Amino acid sequence: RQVIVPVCMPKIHYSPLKTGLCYDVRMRYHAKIFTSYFEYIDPHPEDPRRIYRIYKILAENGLINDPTLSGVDDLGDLMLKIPVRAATSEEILEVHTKEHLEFIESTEKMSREELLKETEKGDSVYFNNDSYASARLPCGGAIEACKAVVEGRVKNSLAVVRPPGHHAEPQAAGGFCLFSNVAVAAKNILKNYPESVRRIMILDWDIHHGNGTQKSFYQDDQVLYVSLHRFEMGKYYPGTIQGQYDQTGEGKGEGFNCNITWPVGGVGDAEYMWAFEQVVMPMGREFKPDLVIISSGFDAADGDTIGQCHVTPSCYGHMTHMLKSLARGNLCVVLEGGYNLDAIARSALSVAKVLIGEPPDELPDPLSDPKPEVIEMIDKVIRLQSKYWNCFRRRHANSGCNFNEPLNDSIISKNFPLQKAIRQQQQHYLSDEFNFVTLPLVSMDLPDNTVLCTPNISESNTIIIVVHDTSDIWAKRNVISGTIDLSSSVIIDNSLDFIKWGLDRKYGIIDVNIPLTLFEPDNYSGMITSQEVLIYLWDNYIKYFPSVAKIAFIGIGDSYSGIVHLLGHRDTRAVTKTVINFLGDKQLKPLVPLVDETLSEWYFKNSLIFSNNSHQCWKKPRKKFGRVLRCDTDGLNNIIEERFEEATDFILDSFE
Amino acid sequence: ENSLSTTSKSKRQVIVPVCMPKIHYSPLKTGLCYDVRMRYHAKIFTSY
Amino acid sequence: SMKSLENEVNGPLTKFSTESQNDFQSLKARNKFLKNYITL
Ligand SMILES: [Zn+2]
Secondary structure, three states: OOOOOOOOOOOOOOOOOOEEEEOOOOOOOOOOOOOOHHHHOOOOOOOOOOHHHHHHHHHOOOOOOOOOOOOOOOOOOOEEEOOOOOOOHHHHHOOOOHHHHHHHHHHOOOOHHHHHHHHHHOOOOOOOHHHHHHHHHHHHHHHHHHHHHHOOOOOEEEEOOOOOOOOOOOOOOOOOOOOOOHHHHHHHHHHHOOOOOOOEEEEEOOOOOOHHHHHHOOOOOOEEEEEEEEOOOOOOOOOOHHHOOOOOOOHHHOOOEEEEEEOOOOOOHHHHHHHHHHHHHHHHHHHOOOEEEEEEOHHHEOOOOOOOOOEOHHHHHHHHHHHHHHOOOOEEEEEOOOOOHHHHHHHHHHHHHHHHOOOOOOOOOOOOOOOHHHHHHHHHHHHHHHHHOOOOOOOOOOOOOOOOOOOOOOOOOOOOOOHHHHHHHHHHHHHHHHOOEOOOOOOOOOOHHHEEEOOOOOOOOOEEEEEEOOOEEEEEEOOOOOOEEEEEEEEEOOOHHHHHHHHOOOOEEEEEEOOOOOOOOOOHHHHHHHHHHHHHHHHHOHHHOOOOOOEEEEEEOOOOHHHHHHHHHOOOOOOEEEEEEEEEOOOOOOOOOOOOOHHHHHHHHOEEEEEOOOOOOOOOOOOOOOOEEEOOOOOHHHHHHHHHHHHHHHHHHHOO | OOOOOOOOOOOOOOOOOOOOOOOOOOOOOOOOOOOHHHHHOOOOOOOO | OHHHHHHHHHOOOOOOOOOOOOOOOOOOOOOOOOOOOOOO
């Protein structure tokens, strides 16, 4: 009966509260003036028909108690309506010039033709007579939203608010933006509360670069800006130098600015997952903010014909879940972009589900292995970030500045040969169990073990030729700092499976190796050497063999030009039947026909070429290359071990 | 205050009905398991 | 025993209505629920 602990209130702060919401029917009047019929078949780069769709679909899943879709108070049990007020001129003037405000104060009371001249005049903007107060309403409303956040009246806030405000400069306007939205609100909270808020991190996932707020805090430290956008230096909007990945702040704002730039359009979800789990979580924890703010734009979602990416809304859920994990719980989300209504509806649904507190759903696919341009992009980011930040140092082993002026080439006369070594070891273990004949070749200045020959090759009927360069080298970087360990590296033989499969069926097997020449971007002289040795070996030995039929060729990597030139400058189609090549990633091999012209069609007939998934093409080849095939992986090893069965079945299909 | 200032005295027609909200996390609670019958098992003080 | 008789009478009950959703007792934590069926 004896009490030991008394009863009291739960001493929590998060989730007895609700989600603050900012919405009004007064932000749907500022509209374009009709010029041409192209706007009927145009995506209408900012329409006012966005925010009511989001409000409707929020009502559609019981998160909003309003059966009639109007600005009400009885929002329900899970969300709290935040009252909206237009900003005063002083708060806009805290970041914007006075003459900009005088320009908009001119634009409020213009005529029709003056408005048309102003719409054509500016940079990708437009105007109306009902533009002033409809520009005065967003940011102050946004100023309301964070005011419910820092003062703790709600858990988190979502302010579904148009027009966007992340492209306008303090000097002038641009990109359908009239004022700022997030920069002015951040300035207002910093000025109004220099007691509870000391560091603000701002993120941008609008697919256009948020140049304006970047400029508004380019020399400050209390704002950490991170954006994600496609760059495409001149072409894609806006395509200025301020969106480049090396713009790292300025002055005392150095080390507080971060761009992320997609090289190519067409990224998906796992690029975003990889970028966040690599980069933004250690930097956000290192910054130790007091408030995070999101400038959201769903233009990069799937089903959008502007950015053309593939971000399912589950990816947005994982995004905002980790961003909720970043701060202590204070959070506000505004909206900037958007072109397709269904995608922004589903996106808003998922972000509202997480912002109430629900766990994000699973990815529609976790096996994607994103595009390598993003990988090299994030390496080039993490170099400069390891200069400025500290947590990236010694984990990616950048080890301070380390911007390396060496890789000088002056002692290149003194070098390890390294190719005779690999080919010599290869010849060693090939002759050790296979006893291959090192067939000689006079009148050329080549190493001895350049061609290796099956013993009793004169009696062998079906002879297959394998042509290869020196096989690949996989090495290991030491993870603590910097360099490469050479002793812990591995030679990856590539032909030997084909050689063994040929040997166990009692076929003639001939191998040739072609070394690569040093300090050459392409092995052009090596291609010359391969043409020379191929024409030589065809003339000196193969024409004279009594028992010979059904010859095939095995092309690997480069040096397919040797077989192409052998097919062109002679005629041997009566005795050989089918060529195969795994190119990988080099330039293709056009065939020149000299002896005939039906030889081109015969080369197209019994031949297959295998290339990378990320080759320079496929962004349809001409028939003078002869039936190339786009595999779905990268690296020569993977496509060999992938389509080895298909190629060896084709070879068995070639014969009887 | 505003010049926008919508002016129509008429009952807006109903658009959607109010239904049960389609969420399945956190109107619910967190389960706890506990019993004092685990405190039966103790050690025999044997050495000293 | 009392749970079994309760779930019996709460199921298909007999002729009258004298005594006779969250929480989903009826196995509705939907994660590979319908998807674990082959749906083809
Ligand atoms: Zn945008």
